[PDB]
Design a protein around this ligand. Sequence first.
Ligand SMILES: CC(C)(O)CNC(=O)c1cc(NC(=O)c2cc(-c3ccccn3)c(Cl)cc2Cl)n(-c2ccccc2)n1
Ligand SMILES: O=c1[nH]cnc2scc(-c3ccc(F)cc3)c12
Length: 296
Amino acid sequence: KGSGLQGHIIENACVHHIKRRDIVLKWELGEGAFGKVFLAECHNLLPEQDKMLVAVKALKEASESARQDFQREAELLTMLQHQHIVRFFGVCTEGRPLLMVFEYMRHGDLNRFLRSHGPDAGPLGLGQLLAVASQVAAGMVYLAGLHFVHRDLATRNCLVGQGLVVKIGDFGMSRDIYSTDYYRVGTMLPIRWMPPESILYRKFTTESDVWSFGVVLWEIFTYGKQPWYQLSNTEAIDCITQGRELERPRACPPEVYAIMRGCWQREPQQRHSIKDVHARLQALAQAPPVYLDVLG
Ligand SMILES: CC(C)(O)CNC(=O)c1cc(NC(=O)c2cc(-c3ccccn3)c(Cl)cc2Cl)n(-c2ccccc2)n1
Ligand SMILES: O=c1[nH]cnc2scc(-c3ccc(F)cc3)c12
C-alpha cells in the first residue's frame, strides 16, 4: 500500500463513530478494486442539518489487517483539519463493509471541474484559475507543515465544493477511475506528475510534492489536459529523466510559468518551498496580472 496516508503512518485521535442507520445511501459516485464511493444523507452529524449530503467510502475487505490499516488511516484523517483539506466526519465499523464518511463536494474532482469549465468543452477566467491554484497551494502548505508527503498530488486528487472552494482530498479510487494517469513498473505510479528522482529511486519527499504542484499548475492553466499527452508512458519517463519541461499553456501568464519552472528544478534542493510558492500565488490571486491569452 502506497497512499500518502499510509506513508505518513509508517513514518509517524478519538475517531467519531457514526451509526449505520444515520447513513442513507442515495447513489454510487464511483467504484474501484477496494470498494465503492456513495453519495449519502447523514443524520445527527452537523447541528443545523438533518439530511446533510456526505460522500461515503466503503471498503470491500474486512480482514484483521485491512481493519487495523483502516483504523490508523481514520485516526490520521481525524487529525487533518484545514480550510483546504476535505472534511472527514468519521467511520461506521458495524461489520462489512467498513465505511469512512467525508463531506460531499458538489462539483466533484478538480480535473473533471476544469474540463467541464474549459474552452474545448463558460470558461473559467484568469482570476478564477489563480484562486484555484492558490487554494491548492494553501492545502499543500498545511501538509508540508506536518511533514506529510502527499505522493499523488494532481487535480484528480482535489475536490471542488460550492463557491469555487477547492480542497485537497480523495476517496482513494483515483488508480481505478483515472487508471490512464498511472503506469506500472513493478505498483501504479503517477509518472507524468513525478520528478526524476521519484521515477528513478521511487523516493517521495516534500520536494517531489512541490514538483507535482508545478504539474498541477500546468493542469489548471490547460483546463485539465494530461501532462505530456502527445507521449506514451515510456516516452514521458524519457522526457522527464532527460530534463525536458512542459510548454507554457496559452492561458498561463509568464509570471505563473516562472512559478512552475521554480517547482521543476532538476535538483530537489533547488526547488522553491511550497510556502514561497503559496505566497507568490496568493499575491497574484489578489492582484491578477493583465494578461490576455489571445495576445499570447
Ligand atoms: C492501491 C492503493 C492502496 O495505493 C490505492 N489507494 C490510494 O492510492 C489512496 C490514496 C489516498 N489518499 C490519501 O492518502 C490522501 C488523502 C487525503 C484526504 C484528507 C482528507 C479527506 C480526504 N482525503 C489527503 Cl489530504 C492526502 C492524501 Cl495523500 N487514499 C485514501 C483516501 C481516503 C481514505 C483512505 C485512503 N488511498
Ligand atoms: O448509483 C446508481 N447508478 C445508476 N443507477 C442506479 S439505480 C440506484 C442507484 C444507487 C442508489 C443507491 C446507492 F447506494 C447506490 C446506487 C444507481
